[PDB]
Design a protein around this ligand. Structure first.
Ligand SMILES: Nc1ncnc2c1ncn2[C@@H]1O[C@H](COP(=O)(O)OP(=O)(O)OP(=O)(O)O)[C@@H](O)[C@H]1O
Ligand SMILES: [Mg+2]
Lengths: 240, 232, 250, 73, 240, 239, 240, 234, 238
């Protein structure tokens, strides 16, 4: 006993335990799904309402790192906001130093290195967040990346982070994203959200959607209200 | 970042420093080494052996020249040697810059010992795990010295260090004297290092360096292969 | 971070500091140095421990160091800390000379070194110094002087002292036979030889197993000498023949 | 769990556990009896007991939520 | 065999050995991949296996081969974030040497400096010693090809044939048996032996879509990565 | 830069390091001090002469300035630095307001230093207790007593160190106005008190007096024997 | 519930069964147990944990089974466990199996209080001085429903203890106990009884027959202030 | 078996602050009363030996011409707060050129209480909150005022306060003899009665000390000549 | 237990215990309620006194002429945080010459409070700040936690024994959007009274009120001119 009290000790089998506990803490989020279309990326998050007192749109889990970059979060909230701030600062510094918008393959590496810097020393603790970055550019295409508390960043075609990650990716697999444009894919994201999180777990929930791609002309922003409403209208037919 | 800044070496109730004893016990399990001085120069010999045939024997060297007339060999841990070598070279260069004269061996040994001592009292740092043999030839008389993880140093006439060093010291007791030559010194060094060699003694398994009044130098493989003949 | 700390500067429920006592008990081994003065000149006697058959005998000295033009010191304990302390006090003396253009008396140097040694038993959380050493010198204020240090940090003047391993027996014999203001620099050597014979269990007192240093005064020289091995065996044979004659008398 | 030692050990209980392991699956198949087991600390349990053929289904009991607590009261 | 905190930090145990470095060598095998490096008469090759468990992932960003400099090639084994940080450090050191001394850095000096950097972690007690391996290949004038290996303990060595991973021992034995014959090696022969060693150790008979091959030779010292068509050609030539 | 708390509050509201320091103080040599009409006398005992010492390098009575002196009890090493700092402060006070330092000021300075040294981060408390005796301006002799905690008091007669309770009990029942009328009577009283419990058979006494006219005047061990004989005769022919 | 078992049945309430008494040493637990055993009318089966440490394997569980069988034989009566912190702390089996037969004894004791017709009409009550080391599975309600706590008296408890421990004295009419109570801010009943005994002994010392106030004051000075070197208290107020 | 300086309890209290709170139950008792005519403070000296000078020990000190402070608990570490208050009042007078009130003094002196730590800066403090309890009394632009300051860093306004080892009994006695139409003389008499009742030894003119402040004059401390006539009429 | 000694370690269940202990410590403060109407934001606080001869502790502070706060916990950290808020608002008013929006202030508070929950040998702030303000988006009410996590609410109540107040607020949530002050304050007072026993309710000496509006700056009412908001309150149902 005593091999898991510090982040600077190796267990006899040869693995750090604190990062595993951080991953376990991350494993209690709700859900966040990201799918890249032919000409952009689409995010979708299902949010749990604790009580009627909280105002609509509180605890936003969908940030804006840059003019063309999105972000999706799972885990603790404080660390997520800190990571968002550091990513914003790094992107601003890169833009000011060189003179053009930072690509994703560099921003993801910088943030992953900053996250990994905390899992070496015994004077700090590992982060408790897992997040997803997405963007679109005219000369680069659509880009999606996933980063976890350990500090491993990968590219993806479609990913899910949170409690029911497997039950969501098993339904992403049936989807064919390589061809169809992401004007109707919001419908698929809504439908895949409503087919998870049985009502026994919690009483009710709300939906949040993002948008970035050629349709939005580079910029990342929230989906329009009418399109989202039509998305729920189409996704509500799962009862059949 | 920041360190610990509290000493990791403390006095035991019996008045002994335990970490120094552990470092010495770790040094005692290293590769054997021998050093002999006889009336014309100094000879340092060591036995190196690769695990398999994939290793390249011309990549790393056990014997390193500090400057034109000082040589040095080690026994103990592997990586801990390199930093010491670098530090010694830097100190020598500093002395040369200050006084415009080549540094005597005694001064370099004193500085290295001071470094090794200073490295066992600071905060959050374990002692070094190697032992050193230093040879030089300044102002007519040659010199041989031995360092110690605790920071002490002595002047010897014939020394065996590493694994099974007591029997080597016993062997050197009955053969060494004060009137010989460099060649006979090399021969007796090879003979006493043969007490722990494997079934075969190939030229690739021996490192020999000699320092005389012309300067320290490491013998080429051909010369060592020749010297291995006419023995045993 | 504080799980690995040993807290090497705290008190104890009985009121004493453990690390200083452990260092004190460490010096209970490893050497035997004695000094005695009664007239012009002070002497140091030391026992050599590195007595292997294959040594070079370099530097013309083993444990006797020179600190100034008219100062000398021995040491007993860990050698590396002894080197550190000697190297550190040498430039203390040098900077006093630089500032005042006048040789530094023994008292001030001893107090400065004791302050430096005490600094580690107050704060910092580091291992203390396991070194105890003797000082001898001559100054124009009080003539000849002998002193003893301590890892704890305190000091004190003396007239005959041993700080080695059998120091109890040496002190007993020193106090059993010593005169105030009569012993010149000829019988003190005989007393030192007798005490060294009794303390060390090895008989016959081989002349290469001891080291003797003397300090006398000249017109303006204040010469410090380390007498060679050719003037030791005569003292030993004189002692042994005197002892045999005394034994035959009784 | 089993372990290896040379000064002292605890082997009798290990032998009874080995016999219990042999009863399930083993050389002679059994198909008329059913086994239910209960515990509240799994990390200290021998891996051979957790084989798929010996203990097939594994059920985990979570702490009750708000609605479950209200129903219990 | 323990006294105090010798099991938890880098201090000497009573037997004279420290365990916190031996634990990183076990931590290396957590990934479960094996890589081989072979040296020829005028060329050097690296072969590695790569596995993508699912089709959702983007297979173009799971490479384990990295390009430090236009003439020096590298491969990693063990944890991922540590390897990425080490590659970043190596690139920085190579650029600094080139700027400061006016000519390209030799491979052996780079490996020595990397080992010197990595040796500090086993000296100070407030940090974890980066449990990942390092294999470097390159070409150098007056010596030909060179392959070098570095391990987390602060140790490095030059080789003629190396293997690192879970199956190190068997592949090392096979390479030793092959090299004892003392047969002159060419480009095709080196590639064939490198592939067959892994094939016989793993006993897979793999397709051309689950290996990565990197080569360097004395006709254009630029480090390059083989495509799938050339790998397929080599594979079909190997099997008669 | 070592920074860790050494002194902390106990679960029942105590500072144990200061108590251990007081325990260490209660293991030193005895020191007695009294004040009179025009002479203030302080003495130390348990000299423990080893017939090999130098009497001028083991003294425990120190002179801070031309009008103050002190005697300590506790750890010897810790006393020197406090003595030096007090001397430096006394000397530096003259560059400011020209009047010489009063014993109140130096006692407050020493107590403040001792107390502050148990609040700062990463140090252990001091282990000495002090008696400071002096005759300030306007002709008013007085003595003060200082503790490792940081509390200083003004008394009329004190005894600190090992075996101080019995000496204090003896002093409480023998201090009278007529006992301090004569100059030599105060010295005789000090010798009698210092010989009450702690054996100190004549050759183990070091006394010093200040007559509020000049600097410190330590007396050689010649009149001590005379005073001992006089007290012995007074006791013998008293009955 | 044992005296008037008609109102609880009428009201349909099942009373609790177990109770644990914890606090610093000297507070009162064993004395309260003595009082309970005096006032009772049913059995009183006393057992101390140190009696359940046997030499052969599988003996403690047998003894517990025999105890509960003998208890169930009679109508309804009580069992007392003294120093329960010696028969089970917590399951911690790491490395070589150490201190686990006592864990089997503790497991049998746990099993006898719940599952498949619990013991029924048996009430147990246990006491300990360091309850921070007991097993989580033993402290849940259903076995240890009540958790009475004994703490150091504030101000009036000390006055009451002084009055009840010195009402068989020989003292005068002008002794005030409020001052004596104010002079011991943190003390236990044992210290107060010892103060009274030492005051009596000081009175007996010389010749006198009536203990005076000065005797009480000096007894307090010699017992509380002088013996505070040991005091046993400061390191158990944290239950360590 | 070592915790940090400022960890939290499962009940959410603290560890060092609670021990500091219950470390002040060992000092001498002090009583302060606020009236519409003035403010009075009284404390006991607790003399232990005849050889000690009773005038050497002091408990009431003055911060400015119209502010006084009474101290309980430890005494060695209560000088820093007093000096800080003096410097603050002098600085405010130098800057704004006006006599600054007592509420601001209490706020400025209580802001420094919760500053212990061992990882931020070099001057700091080991782990120790100031283990003292303070009573402030004075008269300002809105009348006479009395304030109580506590080691936790919380200060409050009180009408009749008692601190020390005999706090509970003194306050239980004070709760029945106070009303808003009470003058200075009867306030002093009642405080003397309470102190006499709760003391250990006999009460005389050299065991206690007292100090009163009125809107007219400045801070005044009683002497051994005007203190005995209020004693014999107890 | 060795997993609950500092804020750096992680429990095997993916939780940190020192933050939970700080949240538990927040619960000892006296109850307080805050809510907002269409064009106003009010917050009411219940005082507490040690003894009958001591004054009641103050709860509602004054951060800026359009931003107010309410505290619950230990007062030193509340004072430090209030000083920080005042300094930030003054800096913003000095540089850009315009009032600082509430959302940016809450974000700054969260960012500053996040830091000490990751280093070694630190501790979280024990406070229960409830923030009320008015800006160009209308009224605003916010809640902060010692866990460096803030929320956006429409009606909240925190402190010791605040579940009954939350129940009442949630039951009558519909009417809050259009009523004026004269009954908004009454709703708040009823919610606050819900948490008290059946002995004493609102004796005009342990209640404080704070209002911010569109046409009026932040105002505090305490124990003298609070009486107008008390009369007309319905008797306590039995
Ligand atoms: N309330 C009390 N009234 C009187 N005496 C008491 C009280 N509480 C404790 N005591 C004293 O405590 C003494 C011993 O108490 P007891 O042995 O029951 O304590 P405990 O808490 O069980 O101790 P331990 O932890 O050492 O077993 C009794 O002799 C009695 O004088
Ligand atoms: Mg008991």
């Amino acid at each position: 006993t005593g091999y898991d009290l510090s982040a600077s000790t190796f267990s006899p089998d040869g693995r750090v335990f604190q990062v595993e506990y951080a991953m376990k803490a991350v494993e209690n989020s709700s859900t966040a799904i990201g799918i890249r279309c032919k000409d952009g990326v689409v995010f979708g998050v299902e949010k749990l309402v604790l009580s009627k007192l909280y105002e609509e749109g509180s605890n936003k889990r969908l940030f804006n790192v840059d003019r063309h970059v999105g972000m999706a979060v799972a885990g603790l909230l404080a660390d997520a906001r800190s990571l968002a701030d550091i990513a914003r600062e790094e992107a601003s510094n890169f833009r000011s130093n060189f003179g053009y918008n930072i690509p994703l393959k560099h921003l993801a590496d910088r943030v992953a290195m900053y996250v990994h810097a905390y899992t070496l020393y015994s004077a700090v603790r590992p982060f408790g967040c897992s997040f997803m970055l997405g963007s679109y550019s005219v000369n680069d295409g659509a880009q999606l990346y996933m980063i976890d508390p350990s500090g491993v960043s990968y590219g993806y075609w479609g990913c899910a982070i949170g409690k029911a990650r497997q039950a969501a990716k098993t339904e992403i697999e049936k989807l064919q994203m390589k061809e169809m444009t992401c004007r109707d894919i919001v419908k698929e994201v809504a439908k895949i959200i409503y087919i998870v999180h049985d009502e026994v777990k919690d009483k009710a929930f709300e939906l949040e959607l993002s948008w970035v791609g050629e349709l939005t002309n580079g910029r990342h922003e929230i989906v329009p209200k009418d399109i989202r409403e039509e998305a729920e209208k189409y996704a509500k037919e799962s009862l059949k | 970042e920041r360190g610990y800044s509290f000493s990791l070496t403390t006095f035991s109730p019996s008045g002994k420093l335990v970490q120094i004893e552990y470092a010495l016990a770790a040094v005692a399990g290293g590769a054997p080494s021998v050093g002999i001085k006889a009336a014309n120069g100094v000879v340092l010999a060591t036995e190196k052996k690769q695990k398999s045939i994939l290793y390249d024997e011309r990549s790393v060297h056990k014997v390193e020249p500090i400057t034109k007339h000082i040589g040095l060999v080690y026994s103990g841990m592997g990586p801990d040697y390199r930093v010491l070598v670098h530090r010694a070279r830097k100190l020598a260069q500093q002395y040369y810059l200050v006084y415009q004269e080549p540094i005597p061996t005694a001064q370099l040994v004193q500085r290295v010992a001071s470094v090794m001592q200073e490295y066992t009292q600071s905060g959050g740092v374990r002692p070094f795990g190697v032992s050193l043999l230093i040879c030089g030839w300044n102002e007519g008389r040659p010199y041989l010295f031995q360092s110690d993880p605790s920071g002490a140093y002595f002047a010897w006439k014939a020394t065996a260090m590493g694994k099974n060093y007591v029997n080597g010291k016993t062997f050197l007791e009955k053969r060494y004297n004060e009137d010989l030559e460099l060649e006979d010194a090399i021969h007796t060094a090879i003979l006493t290092l043969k007490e722990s060699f494997e079934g075969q003694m190939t030229e690739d398994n021996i490192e020999v360096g000699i320092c005389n009044e012309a300067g320290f130098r490491r013998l080429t493989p051909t010369e060592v292969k020749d010297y291995l003949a006419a023995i045993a | 971070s504080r799980r690995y700390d040993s807290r090497t500067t705290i008190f104890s429920p009985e009121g004493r500091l453990y690390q200083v006592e452990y260092a004190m008990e460490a010096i209970g081994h490893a050497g035997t140095c004695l000094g005695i003065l009664a007239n012009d000149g002070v002497l140091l006697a030391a026992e050599r421990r590195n007595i292997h058959k294959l040594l070079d005998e370099v530097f013309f000295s083993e444990k006797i160091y020179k600190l100034n033009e008219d100062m000398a010191c021995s040491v007993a304990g860990i050698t590396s800390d002894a080197n550190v302390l000697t190297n550190e006090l040498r430039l203390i003396a040098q900077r006093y000379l630089l500032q005042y253009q006048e040789p530094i008396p023994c008292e001030q140097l001893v107090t400065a070194l004791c302050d430096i040694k005490q600094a580690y038993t107050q704060f910092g959380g580091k291992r203390p110094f396991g070194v105890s050493l003797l000082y001898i010198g001559w100054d124009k204020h009080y003539g000849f002087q002998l002193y003893q240090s301590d890892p704890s940090g305190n000091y004190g003047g003396w007239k005959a002292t041993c700080i080695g391993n059998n120091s109890a027996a040496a002190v007993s014999m020193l106090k059993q036979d010593y005169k105030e203001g009569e012993m010149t620099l000829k019988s003190a050597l005989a007393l030192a030889i007798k005490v060294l014979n009794k303390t060390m269990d090895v008989s016959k007192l081989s002349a290469e197993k001891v080291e003797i240093a003397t300090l006398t005064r000249e017109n303006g020289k204040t010469v410090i000498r380390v007498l060679k091995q050719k003037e030791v065996e005569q003292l030993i044979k004189k002692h042994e023949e005197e002892e045999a004659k005394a034994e035959r008398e009784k | 769990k089993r372990f290896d030692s040379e000064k002292a050990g605890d082997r009798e209980v290990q032998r009874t556990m080995l016999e219990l392991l042999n009863q399930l699956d083993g050389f002679q198949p059994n198909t008329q009896v059913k086994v239910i087991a209960a515990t509240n600390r799994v990390d200290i349990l021998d891996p051979a007991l957790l084989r798929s053929g010996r203990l097939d289904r594994k059920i985990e009991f979570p702490m009750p939520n708000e609605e479950a607590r209200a129903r219990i009261m | 065999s323990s006294a105090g905190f010798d099991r938890h930090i880098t201090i000497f145990s009573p037997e004279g050995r420290l365990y916190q470095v031996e634990y990183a060598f076990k931590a290396i095998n957590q990934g479960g991949l094996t890589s081989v490096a072979v040296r020829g008469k005028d060329c050097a090759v690296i072969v590695t296996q790569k596995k993508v468990p699912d089709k959702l992932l983007d297979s173009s960003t799971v490479t384990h081969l990295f390009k430090i400099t236009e003439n020096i090639g590298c491969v990693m084994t063990g944890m991922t974030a540590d390897s990425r940080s080490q590659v970043q450090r190596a690139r920085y050191e190579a650029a600094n040497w080139k700027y400061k001394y006016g000519y390209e850095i030799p491979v052996d000096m780079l490996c020595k400096r990397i080992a010197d950097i990595s040796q500090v972690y086993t000296q100070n007690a407030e940090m974890r010693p980066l449990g990942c391996c390092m294999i470097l290949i390159g070409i150098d004038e007056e010596q030909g090809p060179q392959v070098y290996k570095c391990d987390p303990a602060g140790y490095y060595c030059g080789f003629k044939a190396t293997a690192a991973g879970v199956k190190q021992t068997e592949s090392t034995s096979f390479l030793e048996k092959k090299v004892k014959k003392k047969f002159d090696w060419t480009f095709e022969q080196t590639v064939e032996t490198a592939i067959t060693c892994l094939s016989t150790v793993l006993s897979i008979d793999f397709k051309p879509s689950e290996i990565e091959v990197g080569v360097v030779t004395v006709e254009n010292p630029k480090f390059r990565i083989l495509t799938e068509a050339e790998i397929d050609a080599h594979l079909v030539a190997l099997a008669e | 830069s070592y920074d860790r708390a050494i002194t902390v509050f106990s679960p029942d509201g105590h500072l144990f390091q200061v108590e251990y320091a007081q325990e260490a103080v209660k293991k030193g040599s005895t020191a007695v001090g009294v004040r009179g009409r025009d002479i203030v006398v302080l003495g130390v005992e348990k000299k423990s002469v080893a017939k090999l010492q130098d009497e001028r390098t083991v003294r425990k009575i120190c002179a801070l300035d031309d009008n103050v002196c002190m005697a300590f009890a506790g750890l010897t090493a810790d006393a020197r630095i406090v003595i030096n700092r007090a001397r430096v402060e006394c000397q530096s006070h003259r560059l400011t307001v020209e009047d010489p330092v009063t014993v109140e000021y130096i006692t407050r300075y020493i107590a403040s230093l001792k107390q502050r040294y148990t609040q700062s981060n990463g140090r252990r408390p001091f282990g000495i207790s002090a008696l400071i005796v002096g005759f300030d301006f306007d002709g008013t002799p007085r003595l003060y007593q200082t503790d490792p905690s940081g509390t200083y008091h003004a008394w009329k007669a004190n005894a600190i160190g090992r075996g101080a309770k019995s000496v204090r009990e003896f002093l409480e029942k023998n201090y009278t106005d007529e006992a301090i009328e004569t100059d030599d009577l105060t010295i005789k009283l000090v010798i009698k008190a210092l010989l009450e419990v702690v054996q100190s058979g004549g050759k183990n006494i070091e006394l010093a007096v200040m007559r509020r006219d000049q600097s410190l005047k330590i007396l050689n061990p010649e009149e001590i024997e005379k005073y001992v004989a006089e007290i012995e005769k007074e006791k013998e022919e008293n009955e | 519930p044992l005296l008037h078992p008609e109102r609880f049945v009428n009201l349909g309430i099942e009373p609790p069964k177990g109770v644990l008494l914890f606090g610093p040493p000297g507070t009162g637990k064993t004395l309260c147990a003595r009082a309970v055993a005096n006032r009772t009318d049913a059995c009183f089966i006393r057992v101390i944990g140190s009696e359940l440490v046997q030499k052969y394997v599988g003996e403690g569980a047998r003894m517990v089974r025999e105890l509960f069988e003998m208890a169930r034989t009679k109508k309804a009566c009580l069992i007392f466990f003294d120093e329960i912190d010696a028969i089970g702390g917590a399951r911690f089996d790491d490395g070589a199996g150490g201190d686990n037969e006592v864990q089997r004894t503790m497991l049998e004791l746990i099993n006898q209080l719940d599952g498949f017709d619990p013991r029924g009409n048996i009430k147990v009550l246990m006491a300990t001085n360091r309850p921070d080391t007991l097993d989580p599975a033993l402290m849940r309600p259903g076995r240890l429903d009540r958790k009475i706590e004994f703490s150091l008296p504030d101000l009036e408890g000390r006055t009451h203890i002084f009055k009840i421990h010195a009402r068989s004295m020989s003292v005068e009419r002008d002794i005030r106990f409020e001052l004596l109570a104010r002079l011991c801010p943190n003390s236990t009943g044992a210290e107060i009884r010892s103060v009274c005994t030492e005051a009596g002994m000081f009175a007996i010392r010389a010749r006198r027959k009536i203990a005076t106030e000065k005797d009480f004051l000096e007894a307090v000075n010699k017992v509380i202030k002088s013996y505070a070197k040991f005091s046993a208290t400061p390191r158990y107020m944290t239950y360590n | 078996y070592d915790r940090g300086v400022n960890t939290f309890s499962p009940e959410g209290r603290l560890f060092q602050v609670e021990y500091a709170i219950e470390a002040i139950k060992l000092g001498s008792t002090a009583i302060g009363i606020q009236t519409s005519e003035g403010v009075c403070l009284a404390v006991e000296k607790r003399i232990t030996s005849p050889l000690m000078e009773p005038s050497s020990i002091e408990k009431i000190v003055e911060i400015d011409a119209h502010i006084g402070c009474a101290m309980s608990g430890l005494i060695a570490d209560a000088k820093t707060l007093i000096d800080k208050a003096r410097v603050e009042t002098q600085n405010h007078w130098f800057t704004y050129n006006e006599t600054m009130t007592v509420e601001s003094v209490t706020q400025a002196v209580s802001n420094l209480a919760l500053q212990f730590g061992e990882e931020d800066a070099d001057p700091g403090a080991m782990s120790r909150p100031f283990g003292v309890a303070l009573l402030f009394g004075g008269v300002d632009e809105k009348g006479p005022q009395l304030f109580h300051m506590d080691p936790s860093g919380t200060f409050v306004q009180c009408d009749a306060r008692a601190i020390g080892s005999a706090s509970e009994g003194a306050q239980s006695s004070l709760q029945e003899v106070y009303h808003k139409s009470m003058t200075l003389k009867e306030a002093i008499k009642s405080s003397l009665i309470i102190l006499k009742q709760v003391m250990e030894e006999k009460l005389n003119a050299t065991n206690i000390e007292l100090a009163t402040v009125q809107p007219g004059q400045n801070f005044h401390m009683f002497t051994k000549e005007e203190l005995e006539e209020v004693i014999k009429d107890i | 237990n060795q997993y609950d000694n500092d804020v750096t370690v992680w429990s095997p269940q993916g939780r940190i215990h020192q933050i939970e202990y700080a949240m538990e410590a927040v619960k000892q403060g006296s109850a307080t309620v805050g809510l907002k109407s269409k064009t106003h934001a009010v917050l009411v606080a219940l005082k507490r006194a040690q003894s009958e001869l001591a004054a009641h502790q103050k709860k509602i502070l004054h951060v800026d002429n359009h931003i107010g706060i309410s505290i619950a916990g230990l007062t030193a950290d509340a004072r430090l945080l209030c000083n920080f808020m005042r300094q930030e608002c003054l800096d913003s008013r000095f540089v850009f010459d315009r009032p600082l929006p509430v959302s940016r202030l809450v974000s700054l508070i969260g960012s500053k409070t996040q830091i000490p929950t990751q280093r070694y040998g630190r501790r979280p702030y024990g406070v229960g700040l409830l923030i009320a303000g008015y800006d160009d988006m209308g009224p605003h009410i916010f809640q902060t936690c010692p866990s460096a996590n803030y929320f956006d609410c429409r009606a909240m109540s925190i402190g010791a024994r605040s579940q009954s107040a939350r129940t009442y607020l949630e039951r009558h949530m519909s009417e809050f959007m259009e009523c004026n002050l004269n009954e908004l304050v009454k709703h708040g007072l009823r919610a606050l009274r819900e948490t008290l026993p059946a002995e004493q309710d609102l004796t005009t000496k342990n209640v404080s009120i704070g209002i911010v509006g569109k046409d009026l700056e932040f105002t505090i009412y305490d124990d003298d001119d609070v009486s107008p908001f008390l009369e007309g309150l319905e008797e306590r149902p039995q």
